[PDB]
């Protein structure tokens, strides 16, 4: 059989690269990575193109110019490099991915001259299709002689063997496909679009079809901005091609036997071997392991700091002057309580909701923005919404299908995170009624035409509101200043007010702070802890589930009795559970395993100042 010299040389050199390339530490970089390919779910190896370029520049150039031609041989080299380990079945297939290609091309630079070369592009995913199994090499039985033919390559069309393997056999038409000994690969089709940055001025966006295979399937989601590394190929019009096993199914080139009197056109698709984001079962021990040693000692030092509450408060909100209590409340919301389930299967809410009622231009939006920028999972939205979904689900009809579907709202998109809601007093009646269940039961229930669903809304809500008159009236109570109903107010753990103090000194402090922030953007900010440090510390601290002790039990019971005796707003069991949640969050803040009385004292201070502020002018 004729032998492709270039591809074989590439295979040999790639095997050498895999075996010999050395990391900084002196170990073989890719031996330890290939050691992971013994698992059944893992079949792809990610190789940095810069490492390969350092090892051998001629090999890298040959791969770049003949990627489509030589890729199967690189996969064969990987198979050889993995063959030693006993756990791999002989039937397993392995694939190579290439990570860091120095140069990038635009979607409108994908011309015919790029067919078969290694390329990297960026795009916004518009649509993802279901996963399929795709045949790569078929095993067939010959019906004339019962000989078994293996490794029949497929070319965009279901192909059967051309001639029987047996020299005596002359069969050309009768074969049987055997699925159990054939080879399949995972297959996914995605449709991507030009990013808004790349879209030329006054031009309709240009779309592209990308094919993901093996591990790359289900790794990109619609709306994501992703970098794809792979190759540009042509895909013929399969509908025109006729084969012994497959009839044709209802200008281009003419003259192929499989074409009859028909024409064959082509279209360009991108065959991606690697997908990444364009801009890039937990437990305390695993969280620790994910961190480096420096980060772990920083987290421990943070846990040991005796001024942690104040340092965290100042670090999180450096641009805001004053309002220390509001910062403390928002921090406690960020740490959260311990969600629990009862013996009968019902849930006890562990999340904390906070409300901030403010005068105009009092920086409540600043609080919401700080939390939104800090939190990994956080959604910022307005009470008055642009879409029909709003803060909860909506039911909309697909015109073509006539089917009814759920459109998700803000509280659904923020599930397991934080929802910052601005202008919380402008909600509509549908959202107003649904938010009862959303805030307490943490679910949204729908029984409408074509839809019957319970949707998860396990969220912590941080809300910002305006007073009814547009200016806060100290003579009245907080309940008298806002338009929130009493049942909604009972669902909030903490309430805060921000009043415009018509004071010269406060005005002078705020003006100096703003002007200093603008004059020296970098120099103005001074955080005891960096935001990344706080993110790691919060990730570590959320793994603790402090237990309520007996003394804390007695203190909580006494405080609840006092609150009820003191008192359409009223002290309900919700205040008791809010106090429990706040105590749990206070204990969590110090990575502690038991809720001590001190945490209860602090939580009761905050909650008592919230309740009194709700009641009296």
């Amino acid at each position: 059989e004729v032998r492709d010299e270039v591809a074989e040389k590439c295979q040999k050199l790639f095997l050498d690269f895999l075996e010999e390339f050395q990391s900084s530490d002196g170990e073989i970089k890719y031996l330890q990575l290939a050691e992971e390919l013994i698992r059944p779910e893992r079949n792809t190896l990610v190789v940095s193109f810069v490492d390969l370029e350092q090892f051998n520049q001629q090999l890298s150039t040959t791969i770049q110019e003949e990627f489509y031609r030589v890729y199967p041989y690189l996969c064969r080299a990987l198979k050889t490099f993995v063959k030693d380990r006993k756990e791999i079945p002989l039937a397993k297939d392995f694939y190579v991915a290439f990570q860091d290609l120095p140069t990038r091309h635009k979607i409108r630079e994908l011309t015919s001259s790029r067919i078969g070369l290694l390329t990297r592009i960026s795009g916004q995913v518009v649509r993802t299709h279901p996963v399929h199994p795709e045949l790569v090499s078929g095993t067939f039985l010959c019906l004339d002689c019962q000989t078994v033919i293996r490794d029949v390559e497929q070319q965009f069309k279901y192909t059967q063997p051309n001639i029987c393997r047996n020299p005596v056999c002359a069969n050309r038409r009768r074969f049987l496909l055997d699925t159990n000994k054939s080879r399949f690969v995972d297959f996914q089709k995605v449709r991507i679009q030009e990013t808004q940055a790349e879209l030329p001025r006054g031009s309709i966006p240009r779309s592209l079809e990308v094919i993901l295979r093996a591990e790359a399937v289900e790794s990109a989601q619609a709306g994501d901005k992703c970098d794809f590394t792979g190759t540009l190929i042509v895909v013929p019009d399969v509908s025109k091609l006729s084969t012994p096993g497959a009839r044709a199914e209802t200008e281009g080139i003419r003259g192929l036997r499989a074409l009859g009197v028909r024409d064959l056109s082509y279209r360009l698709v991108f065959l991606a071997c690697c997908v990444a984001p364009t801009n890039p079962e937990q437990t305390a021990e695993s969280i620790k392991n994910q961190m480096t040693v420096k980060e772990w000692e920083k987290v421990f030092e943070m846990s040991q700091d005796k001024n942690l509450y104040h340092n965290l408060c100042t670090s999180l909100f450096p641009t805001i002057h004053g309002n220390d209590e509001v910062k403390r409340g928002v921090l406690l919301m960020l740490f959260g309580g311990v969600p629990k389930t009862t013996g009968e299967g019902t849930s006890l809410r562990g999340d904390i909701n906070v409300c901030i009622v403010g005068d105009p231009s009092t920086a409540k939006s600043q609080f919401l923005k700080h939390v939104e920028e800090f939190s990994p999972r956080a959604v910022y939205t307005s009470g008055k919404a642009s879409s029909a979904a709003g803060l909860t689900a909506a039911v909309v009809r697909d015109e073509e299908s006539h089917e009814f579907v759920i459109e998700a709202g803000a509280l659904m998109l923020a599930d397991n995170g934080v929802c910052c809601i601005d202008e919380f007093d402008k909600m509509d009646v549908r959202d107003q009624v649904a938010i009862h269940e959303a805030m307490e039961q943490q679910t949204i229930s729908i029984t409408k035409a074509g839809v019957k669903a319970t949707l998860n809304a396990r969220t912590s809500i941080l809300a910002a509101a305006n007073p009814i008159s547009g200016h806060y009236d100290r003579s009245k109570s907080l309940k008298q200043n806002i338009n929130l109903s009493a049942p909604i107010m009972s669902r909030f753990d903490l309430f805060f007010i921000l009043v415009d103090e018509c004071n010269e000194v406060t005005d002078y402090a705020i003006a100096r702070r703003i002007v200093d922030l603008h004059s020296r953007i970098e120099e103005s900010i001074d955080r005891v802890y960096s935001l990344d440090d706080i993110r790691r510390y919060l990730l570590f601290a959320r793994q603790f589930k402090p237990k309520i002790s007996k003394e804390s039990e007695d203190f909580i019971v006494e405080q609840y009795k006092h609150l009820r005796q003191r008192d359409s707003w009223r002290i309900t069991v919700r205040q008791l559970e809010s106090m429990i949640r706040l105590s749990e969050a206070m204990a969590r803040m110090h990575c502690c395993d038991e809720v001590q009385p001190k945490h209860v004292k602090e939580a009761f201070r905050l909650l008592n100042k919230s309740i009194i502020r709700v009641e009296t002018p």
């Binding site: 231009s361 547009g470 003006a511 002007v515």
Partner: protein
Amino acid sequence: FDLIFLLLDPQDEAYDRRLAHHLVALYYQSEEQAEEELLDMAVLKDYIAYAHSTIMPRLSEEASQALIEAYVDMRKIGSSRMVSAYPRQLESLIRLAEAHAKVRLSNKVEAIDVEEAKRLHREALKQSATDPRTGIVDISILTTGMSATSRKRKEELAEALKK
């Protein structure tokens, strides 16, 4: 909105005559004048492009003190008698000041830029923040959407109906 402007139609006869002469002259404008205006527009476009390319103004110390004093005075106006300003307006001033510095092709924001920003902001407010009944200083119409006099009148009506 940083600036709100009011384009009112006057009842003056002299304004009508002047605008009529303006429009008739435009109706008879010659081709050389049109070409000259096109050239001036091209110069303006090039100037703006260059300024966006290479100018990044920064606040000097004198500009910072000017801005702080400006905000304090705007607050004082209301504090003398209500509220006559809110911190967001200060931000607007900064933006405007920087814009002015960019017009000069200057990398430093000076006191002249702050003065121009104050003048422009104060003119826009005098155009659009005026209460038809009493005066201008009241900015509560922007913050709350209801005139202070209207708020007092509604409070009186509600109290009387509660009587």
